[PDB]
Amino acid sequence: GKYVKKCQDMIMTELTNAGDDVVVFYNDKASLAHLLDMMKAARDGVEDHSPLMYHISLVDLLAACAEGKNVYTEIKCTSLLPLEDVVSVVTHEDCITEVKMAYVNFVNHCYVDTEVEMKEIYTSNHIWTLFENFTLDMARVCSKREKRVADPTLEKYVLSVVLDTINAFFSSPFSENSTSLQTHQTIVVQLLQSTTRLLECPWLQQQHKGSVEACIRTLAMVAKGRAILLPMDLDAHISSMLSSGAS
Amino acid sequence: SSFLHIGDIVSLYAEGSVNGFISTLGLVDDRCVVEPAAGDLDNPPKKFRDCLFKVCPMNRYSAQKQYWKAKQDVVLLQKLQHAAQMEQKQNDTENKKVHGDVVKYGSVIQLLHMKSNKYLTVNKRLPALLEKNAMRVTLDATGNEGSWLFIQPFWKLRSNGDNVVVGDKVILNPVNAGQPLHASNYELSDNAGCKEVNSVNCNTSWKINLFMQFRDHLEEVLKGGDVVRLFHAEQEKFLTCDEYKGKLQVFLRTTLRQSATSATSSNALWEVEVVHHDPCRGGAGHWNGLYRFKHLATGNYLAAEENPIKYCLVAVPHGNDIASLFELDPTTLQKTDSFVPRNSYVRLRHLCTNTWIQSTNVPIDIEEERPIRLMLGTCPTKEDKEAFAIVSVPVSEIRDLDFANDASSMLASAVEKLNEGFISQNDRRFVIQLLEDLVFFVSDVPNNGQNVLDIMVTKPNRERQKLMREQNILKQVFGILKAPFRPLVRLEELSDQKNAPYQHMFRLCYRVLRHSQEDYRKNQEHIAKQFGMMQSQIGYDILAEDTITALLHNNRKLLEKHITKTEVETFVSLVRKNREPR
Numbered sequence A: 001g002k003y004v005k006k007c008q009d010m011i012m013t014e015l016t017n018a019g020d021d022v023v024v025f026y027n028d029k030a031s032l033a034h035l036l037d038m039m040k041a042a043r044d045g046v047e048d049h050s051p052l053m054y055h056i057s058l059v060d061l062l063a064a065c066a067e068g069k070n071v072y073t074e075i076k077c078t079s080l081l082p083l084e085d086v087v088s089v090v091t092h093e094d095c096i097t098e099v100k101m102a103y104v105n106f107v108n109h110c111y112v113d114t115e116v117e118m119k120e121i122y123t124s125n126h127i128w129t130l131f132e133n134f135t136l137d138m139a140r141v142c143s144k145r146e147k148r149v150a151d152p153t154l155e156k157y158v159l160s161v162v163l164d165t166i167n168a169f170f171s172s173p174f175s176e177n178s179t180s181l182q183t184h185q186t187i188v189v190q191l192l193q194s195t196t197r198l199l200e201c202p203w204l205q206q207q208h209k210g211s212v213e214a215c216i217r218t219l220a221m222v223a224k225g226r227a228i229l230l231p232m233d234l235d236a237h238i239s240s241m242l243s244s245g246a247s
Numbered sequence B: 001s002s003f004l005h006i007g008d009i010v011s012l013y014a015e016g017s018v019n020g021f022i023s024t025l026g027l028v029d030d031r032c033v034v035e036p037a038a039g040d041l042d043n044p045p046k047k048f049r050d051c052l053f054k055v056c057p058m059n060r061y062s063a064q065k066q067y068w069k070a071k072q073d074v075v076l077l078q079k080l081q082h083a084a085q086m087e088q089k090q091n092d093t094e095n096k097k098v099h100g101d102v103v104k105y106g107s108v109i110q111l112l113h114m115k116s117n118k119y120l121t122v123n124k125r126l127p128a129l130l131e132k133n134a135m136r137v138t139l140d141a142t143g144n145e146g147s148w149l150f151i152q153p154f155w156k157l158r159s160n161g162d163n164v165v166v167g168d169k170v171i172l173n174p175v176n177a178g179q180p181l182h183a184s185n186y187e188l189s190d191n192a193g194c195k196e197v198n199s200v201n202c203n204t205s206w207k208i209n210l211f212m213q214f215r216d217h218l219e220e221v222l223k224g225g226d227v228v229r230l231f232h233a234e235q236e237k238f239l240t241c242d243e244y245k246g247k248l249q250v251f252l253r254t255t256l257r258q259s260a261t262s263a264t265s266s267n268a269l270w271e272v273e274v275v276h277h278d279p280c281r282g283g284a285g286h287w288n289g290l291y292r293f294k295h296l297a298t299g300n301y302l303a304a305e306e307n308p309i310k311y312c313l314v315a316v317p318h319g320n321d322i323a324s325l326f327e328l329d330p331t332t333l334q335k336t337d338s339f340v341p342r343n344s345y346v347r348l349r350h351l352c353t354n355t356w357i358q359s360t361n362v363p364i365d366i367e368e369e370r371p372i373r374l375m376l377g378t379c380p381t382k383e384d385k386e387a388f389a390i391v392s393v394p395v396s397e398i399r400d401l402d403f404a405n406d407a408s409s410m411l412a413s414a415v416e417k418l419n420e421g422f423i424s425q426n427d428r429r430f431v432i433q434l435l436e437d438l439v440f441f442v443s444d445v446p447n448n449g450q451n452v453l454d455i456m457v458t459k460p461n462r463e464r465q466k467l468m469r470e471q472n473i474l475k476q477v478f479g480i481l482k483a484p485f486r487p488l489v490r491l492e493e494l495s496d497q498k499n500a501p502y503q504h505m506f507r508l509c510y511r512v513l514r515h516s517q518e519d520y521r522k523n524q525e526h527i528a529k530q531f532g533m534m535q536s537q538i539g540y541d542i543l544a545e546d547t548i549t550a551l552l553h554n555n556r557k558l559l560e561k562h563i564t565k566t567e568v569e570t571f572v573s574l575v576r577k578n579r580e581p582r
């Protein structure tokens, strides 16, 4: 449960100076199309030794390396993968849970939780598109639970990395001065609504319940005043949530 | 360009989503907001006095915080009070010693509101009123650990441990909250066009504009933004600006008192403005610098215009014209271009048309018997006898005048609302609260929860009563009394529970009227001029009876003139109706 800064540093430098042989990113249009085709062919699942698994493992390794609130590795990790490609791949109509998890983790550990301020994050619509996709995934989970049939992988994605990224974005010192919050009130409101519905389900575990409660509390705290008001129908349960949190 | 020093008074301009200066609402309200529509850097707002802040160094509040916590053991309490007093004295000594030291990036500084004399602080145990996710910032008279605010560069050119230069954007981070101040776009419902300021992560930057320098802030030298009185030696009279017959006019008011120095009125207060290259820079006036005169109440500036003497002195609404410009020729020798010392004889000269100010005995209000307003024209030549002496003014007078002006503004708004035939419940509550504060101010008694309707004042404050009379606050009270009836409210219907808050409002108004005429002949006569309307409300539970009785019994002449068979008959009828000993 500890991070070795030196190991992360050497891994990052070795990966960068090794070349395209070790690190492969489908950032090109043709490469993006090939990734889309292989992902569509992998609708049933991801093979153990398929190139998609290798790409997911590489993205996870880069995200883990960038972890630890450092500056040496995080800048290089962000440079390797820009936000535009993450939005293009994650926001595509057709996608898979593993790739979404990997990219969301990469964004959380290399963009949201950066040790050094970066202007390109909190002054763009990339993360707001990401948040609308998060709301869509939450709605998908709710609809699936409506029919009593749901995919565990999607639930895990919505519960583990989605909530962590939402909390990090709305709990970082550098995000307190977001300039596009006022123009993007609806989306955040939607997020809150989605979270509320996710908390309304009974199957949520105690640890998951606590994590969702913390995320809702952070969203409400950031949503106190932004030239916005809580809808009364939505506020009906937010009042109970606040009462429970105060207790 | 110059470096920033401790004690300098500078203006903060918000940069980001909303651009504007930091201002404070009216009354004793501690809320801080930003009004982009009020003005900008090119065109500062008219009420610029509310956008001035003074920089102060670190202040220790450990003993004060401990004493406050303990209060919220008599010997222990006394020891804590003594420790707090010693800490305050030590902090004052440190501020005096460290005065004038350069400000370095990354240091801790505090902002003090000169107009309100309250330190800005960020409360870490409560959220903002509007933006719940944000954090509240408020002005505190004594301050606390929240006053501490680290200053950091906004650009990459500067770094920690570097001098701060004027006209540069900086970030203020509270020591406790640790969140840059943000000018939230959330508009204030109470006041349209006002944006609340809170503490939350953002990219807003506060530009620093220098207005008054620690070296030039010496009280011994006249400085821009300071209010004084101009006195004429030969005439032994004071210059003033007043609305004679609906139009503002400037005149040398005559006094029948045996002591000219005691003939001081709030409306006769004048402020000195210095002209500099930067419109927001006042500095300290030099003997070779242009000067302007401003009215502390009406806001108009002194000027000279073609006299229907060739030019007569009048008041203009804006100082954006060379007419308002004036120069002070010293009567005696001066130390080259040294700063003008306070309370020094000077001669006013109008440089716009190259004419010299003078005084004449021709009244401006000849229409009224025994005129008091006197004309002040200009002469092409210079006269040594036309010398005006400067007199200092205590801060208490400025605070009282500002409070009176704000209260008069809200009372005029309330009168307008009442005349419209519809007043909101929130507006009625605000009016009632304002009348409550006015009652407390007239009574000069601390607000300790005692029934203000029965408030008791041992010694009336003559200055406060004169301020109320001259500022037309009593006229506003009379208008409030007369507006609902003129309808909105009826005297016979006051018994109904619906108009109970209106009844309490009339109650507070009558208390105000009674408390402003305690052993003061001028106020007594001013109120008695409305004897007819006061008697029109006789009998009803409004306590017009007690006010009328006190006012008329205090003065023999008023009782002789006003009381007649009709008043006695009304009193007999009402006592028969009620049969009460009162």
Ligand SMILES: O=P(O)(O)O[C@@H]1[C@H](O)[C@H](O)[C@@H](OP(=O)(O)O)[C@H](OP(=O)(O)O)[C@H]1O
Residues within 6 Å of the ligand: B254, B255, B256, B257, B263, B466, B521, B522
């Ligand atoms: O001593 P008394 O009998 O009250 O008379 C005072 C004085 O003689 C004037 O009537 C008046 O001054 P001005 O003529 O200059 O107005 C002043 O009121 P003021 O305080 O409003 O000036 C009075 O208080």
